[model samples]
Each structure stands twice: as C-alpha cells, then as structure tokens.
Target: KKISQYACQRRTTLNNYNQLFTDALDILAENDELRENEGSCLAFMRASSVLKSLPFPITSMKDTEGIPCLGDKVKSIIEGIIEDGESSEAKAVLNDERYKSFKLFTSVFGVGLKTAEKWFRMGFRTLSKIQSDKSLRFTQMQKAGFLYYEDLVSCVNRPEAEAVSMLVKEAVVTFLPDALVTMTGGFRRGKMTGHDVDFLITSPEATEDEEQQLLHKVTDFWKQQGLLLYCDILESTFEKFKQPSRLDHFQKCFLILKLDHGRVHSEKSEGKGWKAIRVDLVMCPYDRRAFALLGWTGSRQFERDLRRYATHERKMMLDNHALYDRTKRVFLEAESEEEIFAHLGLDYIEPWERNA
Candidate 1:
C-alpha cells in the first residue's frame, strides 16, 4: 500500500522539478531507517507530489509563502526541509505516541488498521501484552505472525531461496510429473534476497485446460502430505469477475509451507512442531502463463505502475490473468511476455527492469 501510494503520486506530475521532488522522496524512502517509520515515510512521499504541482518550491511565511492552499505551519516545515536537509516537524509527528504504536501494531499479519487502532487504544503496546490477554482473538495467520515475529522479519537470501525452490519442485515432481513450478517475485527479478519467495506453478502442457487439472492434484497432494500448513483457496469464478486478481483464477491455491528452521529446539506445548515460514504458491492456466509470470515477478511497485499504465493510457485491463481491451471488450491474448507488451503497444521490459 505504501509503494502503491508512492507510485500513484509519482505518476501524476510530469515535469523536471516534480521529478526532482520524487527523486528526493525516493532517496529518503530507499533508506531502511526512514522506511522504519512507515506512516511518516508515506506522508512525506505523498507530500512530495503535492509540492511538485506548485509553480515553484515555496520559500517562506507572510511575504512570499503566504499562499492560499499552503498553510502557515506546513509552509514553515517545508522551508525547514528546503533550507536544512530535514524537517523537525515531520520527525516530531513520527515520534508521536499514537503513530509509533500504529506502525508497530500493523506490522503483524492479520492486524489491520481497525484492529491495530483498537489494540493501541486499549494500551496493548507489545506482543507479550497481546499474548497474555486471552480476551483478544487472534486469527490463524496473525497467531503464526506473532509466533515467528523475529524470524519473519529476517530476510531470505539467494541460497535459501534456491533451497526452498528445490523443496517445492520436489513436492511437485514427486506427486505430479506434469506439474512444474518456477520462482517469481523478487527472486525471478534477480534480488539477492527478499522478504518471502513466490513460486508460480502450472502444467507443462500446451493447453490451459490441461494446466487447470494439475492445480487440484498438486495442491491436494501437498495438503495431504502436511506440506501446506496454512492456506487460502478461492474459486475460479471469483477470479474471473474480479479486476486485478492475479492469483485468483486458473484453479489457484495459495499454500504456506512449513519451513524447518533447521534448528534443534525443544518442542512447543501446542500447535504444529515446525516453524511457520512464509512461502507463496500460485497456480495458473498455461494460456495465462505469460501474464501470471509477469505479474508475480514483481518488484510489486513496478507491476502496479505497469497495470496503471495499461488501464489508463491503453484503455485496457491488466492483471495476472490476461490483458483485456476495455474499448474493444475483448481479451487480448498473448503467448508470451513479449506479446503481452506488444498488445499494450509498449516495448518489452525485462524482469530486472521491473524493479522500477
């Protein structure tokens, strides 16, 4: 959501000064320290766009900066950041009690805005507080999220990603010979490491119908073997009706693999013995393979920007499934990523460039 907001705002203004404003915001955003304060980072990212639309960057108060839309206080802060490298006002907001709590609370899975606000208001600052209180109901995903908070925060490197890929491939090949899985997301795009690894599975057959049959067999087999610890399955029809539902169609199954931490630790009192590692698996029809691969091989922001470009500029719908022409009311068919790009009338940009 933060990246989406940044992408939308950055796409709005089309000028050199606006580019510089976005560049500075991006520079700050790229820093792990700045991104640690999520709300403040997003606010600054949005503010950069607002400042860019202006005729000239604001200077000061009553005389030159007494502009109507620009509030006196905001003008002062802007002047500070412009004159100095940073603004104390923004930093003060970042350190506010409520904002700090909001950031911390939502970092947990299944702890959304409304839930986080409730917990914050009730003075639940730490995970220990939430765990001790039996009154709070934690969803399966959130419970898993809290249990592995520290490990979840740690990233997976290229070697670990490769190992995970092999595990998934073994599962696929052992049960279903026709089944095939390819690494996507940050891994496909050549990141050395990522928060999680994504695998796109499909049948090696040429037909979409043949690929659809493989999903049920593969997912059901994985579930039976206890490899799929947690999952969210959706209907194909649901995916068909929904816009931008990438992993929704083609008999999709999302599985969370139980990744062994490779540690010899004492077993817990309840629940499963193994550690919960985040692994995303998506199945697609062979017909939509190109679109699905492109969608999942995301530097998430880049995928979003490309979709925005397709819909707004090209008058088409771009999702993980396929690209559809809104004006023609027909689905644009593509056999590969190159064809998909050609359908959108744009030059094909490789996986690495997708990080943009």
Candidate 2:
C-alpha cells in the first residue's frame, strides 16, 4: 500500500526501521525550527512523519519514489543516508557552532528557541556562560529549570508518573469530587517513560465557567499543601475563537512538582529531600473533554496531520475545543474520542495505538 499523506491515516508504531533517515530529517527539522524557519521546518517534519509510518525500511532512493511529502531536499537527505549511512547536511548542522550552542541552551526545561537564539547571538556558548552573565534576567520558570536541570532532564518512569498522577488526582478530588483526571501524552500512548507527564482534568458537575476557575483552586491547594515547586498557570482562552495552530485553549498550568522521595520510589536524590518533576495540568469543560484529551494526548506529528486532514480534506476546523464543519456551517459534537474519530470518518485508533 502507498504511504498516506496524513499521519493519522497510517499506523505508526514506535518500532521504526528507518531510524537513520528519519533521525537526519528530524535534526534538519529541529535546525529549521531553531532558525524560526517554520515553513521549512514543517516540510522536513512532514517528510520525517511519512518515513516514520512506513512499514518496511527503505533500502534505496527508488523505494521512496511515490511517498508523499518527500520533497527534493528530503529526498536528497535520504539518498545521502542510503549511500553513506549519513546525511552531510545533517552532519554539517550538528557541527555548526550556532546549532551546537542553541541545542545546549534549549535543553533546559524552560528555555525555548527564541531565548536560545538570543543567547547564541550574544556569544554565549555554555550554560555556565549564561549563568555567569549577571545582567541576564531569568524567569521563575527558567530559575527552576536551572535549579533542577539534571533531574528534570532525566526521563520519568512509569512508577514516578503513576505517583504524580495519584497526587494530582488526590488534590483535584478534594475540591471537585467528580473531576476526572487522566494521564495523557506519551505515557497515555504506552511509552514506558517520558520527559514529563500530562494530565487532563474535567468534571461533569461543573459548567464551562466553573471549569475555568478549577485550575486556580487546585493549584492554590497544592501550593498550601507544599506540593508545588514552581507553578505558572495560564487562564482559558476558550472564550475566544479558535486559531489554526497546535496551541490549546484550555485553562492549564505548567508546573514543576516537588515529588516527595517518601511517597514514590526514586533514585538517590544526591542528599536532596525531593526531586522536581515536570507536570502539565489542563482543565476542560465536560462537553469538550474528549477533544481536549485527543489533542493533548499527542504524538505531535499525528496531531498535525489530523488537523491538516480535517481542514484541507474534510473542510472542517478541528481544534481542542471543538470541530466545526465548514460545509454544514455547524459545530460537530463528540461525547467520546471514538465518536470524534467516527465523525472524522476514521476507524478509532486506541490511545496505545496512537504512538505515531
């Protein structure tokens, strides 16, 4: 069968055999994104996503002839990989000074491409250099990022994720008894570990306005109870119209949770009492809970293509908040994730099967 243009139309397991080619494409994509070349970055991302979904390995350039999204640049990278086991352009990007330093700077939890690029332009090459610059102001999140740099970079195992989930559940249930808390993202896709854990929170008893205020109350409780190490909450923008981007409109908090060493099994804290773990808490209205869950529980490429398929092919606008059918000029409602997929004319792919 031919490779599907939309990532959601194909089944992509974690066991990809074209790692060599995909890895090069991903590096190029990252480099483009770092440079703020979003269009070029997306092209490379689409190429990489196509290769990732292939059932068998590509042994030659001819094997990729009919593949969707494999533009000239991507084809050249694959050809180089096939011939020499590496892409010279990808290698060049790795060796480039700006790319090297930007990669290091952005590795910090709170750091992003814009900040990384600014530091790079200022001739800063290392984290130590950034730290030594006294005039460089750090955000609260950035400070926490540096404070727990080592621990935060460490992968969160299943046990730690479960412990964090339980902690969040306990805190939410105390205020809103009927709230549903589900762990999403890579963990929901059955990954054994992840960079951070994500949870979706909603309640059947609350209205949309009530749900918007829920996160603040929960965060306040966690703060008083000493569970939050760092919390930066963003209020809901669901009241506004949706945009055609990956950004969600839910009321959410990006937090660094102080995971007590006593409550969960963890590695030796190097004499510390607790380890800082990254956690995302998103609150959704009951009606849009499934859309929230589907959007937040993502393999980014899969979500990108899913949205693309909705807009381009189906003539619908699909966001975490709701799906709008342009042709019917009505908003489609889905009670469950399965219903969402069915509405999109897709077979329901279970959470574990959504690892694309």
Candidate 3:
C-alpha cells in the first residue's frame, strides 16, 4: 500500500514502531515551536506523523525509499539515528537552557508559551525560583496550576479517564437527560494515557438556553460536591448567519477536578485517596454534533492535514462547526462523520485510525 501525504488518508494506530526517529523529530518540532518558527515546526510535525503510521520500523536508508513527508533534513536525522542510535541534533535541543526552562514552565496547566517566555526572559530557570518570586503576579489559572503541579504533570491513565467520564455522564444527564457526552482528544484515538481529558456534549432535545446553560449547571454541581478544584468557562460565540474560526467557539469549561480514591478502580492511588485530574467539557450544538466529534477527536496533525487537504485537494473548507464547498457555494451537511468524509470524496478514517 502507498502512504499519502495527507494525514487524513493514513491509518495511524497508537502502536508506533518508529519511536526513535519520531521522538527526535518531535523534540525538533517542539524546539521549533519554542523558536516560533511555524513553517519548520509543521514540516517536522508532518515528517514525524507519517512515520507513525508505518507498521514496520525503518531499518536503514534503503527502507525509506517510498516514504512521503521525509525531507532532506528529516532524512539526515533518521540516518544519524541508524548510525549512532541517538540524535545529536535532538540532544542539542534537549540541553539548551531556554528550551529546558520553557518546557519546565509551560508544563503547568494555566502557563502557556506567553507566560513561559516571560518567565524565561525574566531569568527564571526552575519552578522553585518562579514560585518563590514575590514580584511575579500569577493569573488564577497559573496559581491553580502551580498548586497542583505534581498531580497535573503526571499523566492520566485509562482507568482514571473512565472514572472522570463516568462522573461527567452522570452530572450532565441530570441537567440534560438526552445529552450525548463523548470522551474526545487522544483518548478517543485509543491512547492508553493522556495529559488531559476532553468531552464533547450536545443534547437532542435541549433548547438554546439549556444548551448554553448545561455547562454552567454541570460545573456548578461539581463545585457543590467539592470535586471542582479550578473552573473557567468560556461562553460560545457561534452565530448561525456567519462562519466559525478554525477553532469554533463552542461553550466550554476547563477544569481541574479532584478525583477521590473511592471514585477510581485503580490500586495506583492507595495513599493519596485522590488525584487532581485536568478535564474539559465543550457544549456543542445538537445539529453540528458530527463536526464537533470529528474535530475534538484529534491527534492534532490529522486535524491540521484534514483542513489542509479539504482546502487544497478538495476545494472545500472544514472547521469544527461545518464544511463549506467553494465550488458549489453551499455548506455540506453531515448527520454523521461518514457523510462528512463522503462529502470530501474520501474514505472514512475512524477515530482510532486518526493517530496521525
């Protein structure tokens, strides 16, 4: 079978056999992100993504012949891995002072690239130093992030994710009984562990007020139960007469939940009784459920290239809300994801196959 440059065309499962090359490429891509080099960052990201879909490991230069997205720079990194079992180029990135500090600072939940850059520019190296600085004022998000640093940095496992999922379902259903709550992000693509958990919610019978009010109610319920450690809800800005951005403004809530030991089915938490789990809930309109599901269930590269392919290859525009056909001058409607792929003149790539 031939590989396609479009990530949407590739079936990338979680079982990656080319971690050596992909890992090095990932570091380089991340460093490019730190440097704010969008072109190089996406190039490396695409290079790493395609290799992840391969079933067999690349043994040598001979095995890379028919591969797509492997540019000269990517090839050099692969050749170095084959010769030395390590990437000196990646090593340079790993050891760089700014890279280390940036990675360290941004690992906290509320801290993004902007905050990380500011801390780096201010000569802050360690989290300890940043925490101790009295002059530095932190946003509410950053403060919660620092307070729960230890738990937030640790990855959430499948069992823990399901526990959170269960809580969400029960809470959401109480307010909107007909609501559909889906676990999205990496977990939807069959990942065993993830940094955070996300769910896309929409109800079949909810009125406009209920659709917008559901998130507020669920979060308020969690707050009452003392399960909500931190909460920030962004109201939706979707307008029927207009179009949505690449990131649609679906009413959503970002949270750090306190998962009690009794709630989880794992022995991993015997002593602490509970862990601080990062969770997100998005309220999508019922009619646009399919698009919301497709977009939220992402490996990032798949979503990126799906948009890229839709525009360049198919003369269509796709976002989290809807798909627009430039040629027909109409918005294509999809009740399910299969119709969306069919509309794009492509085969249906299931969630688990979207690891790219």
Candidate 4:
C-alpha cells in the first residue's frame, strides 16, 4: 500500500529498524551535500524520510514498491541493500577521500559546508592541520569550538539536559519571574540524548517589542554570574515586515555553558571539574508561544514536511512565529500544537511520534 508523502501525515516513532537502508541513504545524502549537489541531497533526504516512516523493517524490494519519494536512483540503492546487505555506491563514497575529509572538517562546531570545502581545497584534511596553520584566521566561535572540541562532541543525556534546563529556568526567572521557559529540540521530542540543549522563553507581560530586549538582559545576567563560557546574541528582526525565511524572527542567543561537575552526572574530566555544553535560548512573545514551541520542538524532517504540507496542500504559510492563511487573507489562531495540526486537517501526532 502507498503511504503518505508528507511526514506530518504519517506517524514515525523511534522504531527505525531499517538502519541498513536509511544509513546508506544518509551517507549518500551527505556525499551529495559535500559535493554541493543540493538537489540530489534533497532527493536522498526524501528517500530516507520515506523509509523512516515505515512501521516495520523493510526486508525485500517489494516492501518499498509503493513508497512515495523513492526515485529510481534511491530504489537502486535499496536493491543493492536487499541483495548484498549494503550499497556499493554508499561504500565507495564512504571511503572517498574528499567526502572523508569534508566529514571531518564539518564536524567542528563552527565550520560550515563552504568553509569545509575551502579547507579541503587548501589541502587541510585534519583538525590538527587546521590548528597548526597559524596563517589561517578563525572566528570567535571557531576558536571556542577548538577549545572544547571533545566535550561538545559528547552527547547531552536526559539528566544533563534537565540540569541545563533548570539552570536556564533559574536565569530566566531571575530577570522575569513570570517568563515561561521550555526545553525544545530533540529533548522536547523525547530523545534520551542530543547534541545540545534548546530552550524557548516567553512572557505574558511582555509585548513583541518588549521581548526584543529580554535575551540580552538574560545573557547579561549569565555573564555577570560567570556562567557563560561564550555567548552570542542576535536581536529580533520581527518589527520589519519582510518575507519569511528558514530563520525565525525571534530574539535569541547561542551559548556555551560552563556546567559544574556536581550539577549533573557527566563524564569525569581529568583536568577541569566542569564541562562545556552548547545551549540555545530563543525569546518569543506570549501570544506566539505555542507556535514557537511546535516549531522548535522538531525532528527537523517533520517540521520541513509540515511547512511543505501547509503551503502546498493548505494554501497557508507556517513559520515559528505564526501561520498565515493565504486564501483567507488572515492569520490562523492556534492556541496549541493540536490546534495547529487541526487547522491543517492533520491527525494530532504526539511529539515522540514526530521523529520523521
């Protein structure tokens, strides 16, 4: 039977038993992205998304016959997996020198695709090489990234996430006692571990203009308390009317926190008693809280499909701040995530089930 094309229309729990297929497709996707083939990369991403939504393991070619988004190229990879338990293309790309080098370069916290490609072209294959090249300059974030490479690469478990959540709540409340703080991202989707912690803050007493200054105040507080290892604040641009992009308009800050060893159970470090952990704090207005929560609490693929469904199938534009109904010529009011899904005529999939 044919499954839905939209990820939001399907229930994708964490029961991804077809790792053999998805893992291969993911590698191919990465390879395409490293080569700057965005169109091909998206094709492989869609193929992986289709397999991720399957309720059971795919054991044969017939199992994928009616699945949506599986183009011939992706289907050929799956055929390889079924016959030999691995894709030959995937194996070759995995061992490709350029792909291997780009993978290592982009793993650094601040490095992006362009920078990785630039370094690769300059004959820099390893982190050690990049560090030794004193002629190369780095941004502040890049410097901090190298300073705490090991700790940042380590995953943030549920306990550690909770500890960070509490710390954030304290800092937020100290400045605005009535402000709301939510743990978003993978943690909100019920993942036991994640690369970093994400949080959303809002206050009923504050207007959108007032919310603009909130993140700076909170970050200033953290700086005064000496809790921040590094912090970069970006002011909100919501006041200016403009076309929406992938980036949200909410005022936010990206931070590296100095976590005390006693606050949470973490890997014991030999030198320093503390660890460096990445955290993101976004401040939204109270009226937009639910939408902000839903947008940030993402299994990224789910969010992408939700927005696509809204635009293509429902004639609406959905973003983190609000939803605009193009046909109705007005914004749709959604007090809860269920209401947002209902407005789009989608079944209410729980947070954990949104792991597409």
Candidate 5:
C-alpha cells in the first residue's frame, strides 16, 4: 500500500506503533518550534505524523521501505534509536538550556513563546524564580497563570473533562435553551488526557445579536458561581462571504476554570478539593458547526494537512468556518463532517483516527 504525504489521507490512532522514532521526531519538531523554524518543524512533524499511522513498527532500515514522509534526517534519527534504544539528537535537545527553558516556561497558561523567551533571556531558570521576582510586572493572564501554576501544570483527566463539559453545557443552556454545545480538541478526539478542554457552542433559533452574546453570558454565569478563574474573550470578526483564514474569526473565550473535587466523579484529585483547568469556548454561527467540529476536533497536524491538501490538491480552501471551491467561486455547505470529506473527494476519517 502506498502512504499519502498528506495527513488528511492517513488514519492515525492513539495506538502509536512507532513511538520510539516518533518520540524523537516529536522532540525535534518541538525543538524547531522553540527555535521558530516553521518549515523544519513541519518537516519533522510530518515525518512523525506519518509514522504514527503504520500498522506495525519499523524495526530496521528495511522496515522503512515505501514509508512516506521519512526524510534523510528523520531516517537517521530512527536508525540511531534502533541502535542505541534512544535518540541522541532528541537527548541533546532535551538537555539544552534554551530548549529546557522554553519547554518549562510555556507549560504555564498565558506564558506563550515570546514571554517564555523573554524570561529565558532574563536568566529566569525556574517558575519559582519568575514568581518570586516581585519587581516583575505580569499581565493579567500571566498573573492568573502564576496564581494557578500548581493546579494548571498537571494533565486534566477524563472525569475532570466530563465535569467541565457538564459545567459548560449547563451554562450555555441556561442562556440559550436550545443551543448545541460540543466538547472539542483532544477530548472530543477520544484522548484519555489533555492539557485543556474546549467546547464549541451555537443555537439554531437565535438571532445574530444572541449568537454574539452567548460567550459573555456563559462566562458571566460561571463568574456568579465563582467557578471562573480567568477569562479573555475575543469578539467575533467573522465576515459572511470572506474566504476562510488559518485562524477562525469566531468569538471565543480562553478560560482557566476552577473544578471542585466533588464535581468530578473520579478520584484523580482527592487531596486537592479543586483543580484549575484551561478551557476554551468558541461561539460560531449555527451554520458553521460541521466545519467548526472538524477543525476543532483535531490533532493539529491533521487539520494543517487537510487545509494544505484542499488548497494544493483540490483547488479548494478549507478552514474552521467553511470550505470554498476556488474554481467554482462558491462556498460549499455541509451539515455533517462526511459531506466535507465528500466535498474534498476523500473517504471519511473518524475523529478517533485523526490523531495525526
């Protein structure tokens, strides 16, 4: 069988058979991200993503035959893993001070690449040091990140995600009784754990004015419950006939929510009564959910290549909002994900198989 170069053509599950090679490639991809090398980062990322879809492990040089996306540098890294049972290149990056600092600082919510880099350049080695430096003024988002540093760093589990889902759904329905709320991101992709939870919400009967107000209403409801820890809302700048861009213009909120131990059904956080979790709530127009779900229920690599395939191979443009056929100069409508896949002339891939 021939493997396609695009992740959109691949069925990658969480059951990674080539993790040794993929893990190394992942570190290399992450290292590239830290260095802001987009092209090189995607090269390694594509290499790793393709390997993840293999039915069996690549045991030796001969085993890699016909595997797409495994370029020379990636192949060498796999060869090293095959010989030493670890990747020398990945190890070097792991120990490198800048890479370590980038990894550490960016783990906190609101502390993105720039802030992490700034902290690194200032000789800030640890979170404690950054927090203890009283002279440093932090942004509101950063202050919240620091305040909930302990609870936010750990992985959020399935039960906690469910609890948050319940909270999000409850809040939305109170404001718009018929609104549809869906869990997106890794949780929606059937991942067992994730760094954060995301929800996509919309109501069919609501007016444009009502659709624009849902997030504010929900966030305010959470605030009343004292469940809202932090919120940064971006109002919708979505234009109806505009071609979609890489980032969707839907109004959304990035939040750090406080989850009580009693709210979650599992024993994951028994000692601590509550945990601070990152949550993103996106409000799209009612007509755009199918596209929104397909985009948000992603393993980033899958969406990136899906868009790339649509543009390069199909002469179509796709994003979180809609799909447009460039040749026809028309926007395609889909009430479901299968239609979108059909529009792209590809077989439907389930969310669980989209882990690429």
Candidate 6:
C-alpha cells in the first residue's frame, strides 16, 4: 500500500533464484532423513547461486576460497560442474535405481517413506502392481491415493490453492465466526503450484481454545454434506519424552477432499467424481499460530533448519507446535514468523527460501 518505488522493487525480488531454491527444496523434501541432513541441499543451493552470478565459467575459483558460505565440499562440487558442465554425484543419484523407485512410489496419496519401502521390499515396482494387489489392506484414503496418484503428486498452482483456501475459509467462518484461517505451506510462499494445500485455524476466544473445535465443526459439516471421501484426525497431547514444544497441546485433522471433476473440469479442479484431493488441516490456539504456520508452511528442510537453529545455537527447543526456552523452561510467544526468527537471533527467511 506504500506509494514508493522501494515497494515495487521489493515485490519484484520475491520470486528470485533464492525463492526457487526454497520451492524446489520443499517439493524435494519427503521424510526425516532428508529434513535432518538438508545441509547438503543447502550447499547445492549456495554453490548454484555463485555459478549463476558469474559472467562466464572461470578456469578456476581461487577467489571463492575465503568465502564465508562456500564450504570445501560444496566448492569441489561446483568446480567440477563448472569445468565439465556435469556432476558425478548428480548423475549417479539420478540413475540410482532405488532412489528412482522411491520417488515414483511416494507420488501416490497416503504413501510416504515407510509405505514406499514396504512396497519395494515386496517387489511392487509399479503403480499398476500396487493397485491390483488385493492382499494389501488399503484404507479409504489409500484407495483414493491409488486412483488419482498422478495428479496428487503434481503441484497445485496458486489459483487452485486459492480456491482450496476459500473453501476452507468458508468452512471455518460458517462454524466459528471468530476463528482465523490461513493458507500456509508452499501456497503461502507464493509458489505457482504445491503438492498439497495446508491450512491452520485458530480463534480469538478462549472458549475455542481447544484446537479440535474447528476440526470437528468442519469435518462434521463436510461429512453431513457428503463431501468428504476420507478423513483422519490425530490429537497431540502431552506425553513424557514428547519433548516440550509449542504444538504439544494442538490437534490436527488430515482429510482427502472430494471433487466432482465432472462439474469442475479445468486445470484448477481437484479431480473427477468420487475422486479425492489431498488436503492437510491443522488446528492450533491463537497463541501458537505463528509456530503452527511456520511448521506447516514448510519446504520441510527449511523448517528443520529453523528448528536446528533454535536448539543447537539458541539452546531452545522447537517443534511445529511451539518454541520452548530450555533455560527458562517456558515457551516463547510470537505474534508472527518474523518474531520467531528474531527470538532465535536469526534473519527471517522468506517461506520460499525455506526450502533450504
């Protein structure tokens, strides 16, 4: 709303190379292993940035030796790519049979690392094989997973995400007028598309303090309307060794939203009749909105880095639910993502750059 060229310049840079790196990273992020060891991917990003900034490929990068961010391993990888326009590690991993299969298997709805591993061990190499195998018990959601496997793996563009957001917003407002809803995840980061739409809902009143309130209302409404194909809700409560984090008291609901692709046939449509689209719904109290949004808005690695930054550097404990100060034995309060980053003494990384 500011009348200044500075505002225009800022908006123009939001989708730059760094933002692409974050979006790619979020799309690439799958499980805990990838999330925890994402420094390698971050290194890849930093090295790629240097290469892009150069006018031409240098014979050598001696000048890069003293750079603060350029580590030795990253330097070697970049130098090799510059010298030969190809990378040994990249080629090797691209051709790795297991990695390729895992990528394919996880593309299905309700399929993650564990399911992918199980399928691989059972010699189920193709989607057709997985679908036809009658012995394997498939949940209603998993059945939907099999039906629209291809489209679900593809990203949801902003227009589609906005439509999804509006539907969710309507659901929230109808049930609880005081509730607030936000479209986070890749969509909030302004991606052209996303794997799934994520939303977080909170309320202004303590009467709606329980995260489950909104979840129950929306799911019940959808169920009564005969719109939900498959749904599951998991409540997060305090438990020993659960590690104190902001989300400890929150409740989450995951649902596969059904769309009659026949009625809405377009790029934005979720899918055909009785066909389901994967959507993630998380509920939190107003106090933990920032933590919840940051966690759900993940390029999973970026979220991990934010957590790691809190724990290792700040001696604070972080989770999708909240950040806890170990020294004070108290949870940190934040009104926004910027506040959370400030509390950790770190620069606020934009959602797109969070891919790292």
Query: Which predicted model would earn the best lDDT?
Result: 3
For model 5, residues 244-335, the per-residue Cα lDDT tens digits are: 66354689889999898798887643576789989999998888889989978988899989999999998999978889998998999999
Question: Cα miss at 61, model 1 (Å)?
Answer: 19
Model 6, 94-183: lDDT tens digits are 566666668788777777778778888898888888888888877676777876676676666565566667778878888777888888
Question: Candidate 1 on 132-177: residue-level lDDT in tens?
Answer: 8989888887876776676567777676677678777877676556
Ranking 2 against 5 by lDDT, winner: 5
Runs of candidate 6 with Cα error greater than 4 angstroms are: 1-60, 66-73, 206-211, 238-249, 260-275, 328-330, 352-355
- Model 4 residue runs over 4 Å out of place are 208-210, 240-248, 265-271
Per-model TM-score, in order, reads: 0.69, 0.93, 0.97, 0.95, 0.97, 0.76
Comparing 4 and 6 by TM-score, which wins? 4
List clashing residue pairs in candidate 2. Answer: none
lDDT of 5 at 179: 93
Candidate 5 runs further than 4 Å off:
267-272
Q: Provide the overall lDDT of each model, using Cα atoms, as 2-decimal numbers.
A: 0.63, 0.85, 0.90, 0.85, 0.89, 0.63
> Candidate 4's residue-wise lDDT over 272-351, tens digit each?
86778999999987877878888888777899889999999998888887888888978887878899999888999998
Q: For residues 249-321, write the lDDT of model 3, one tens digit per residue.
A: 7898899999886887876546677999999899988888898899899878998999999999988888788
Overall local distance difference test of candidate 4: 0.85
* Number of the candidate with higher lDDT, 1 or 4: 4
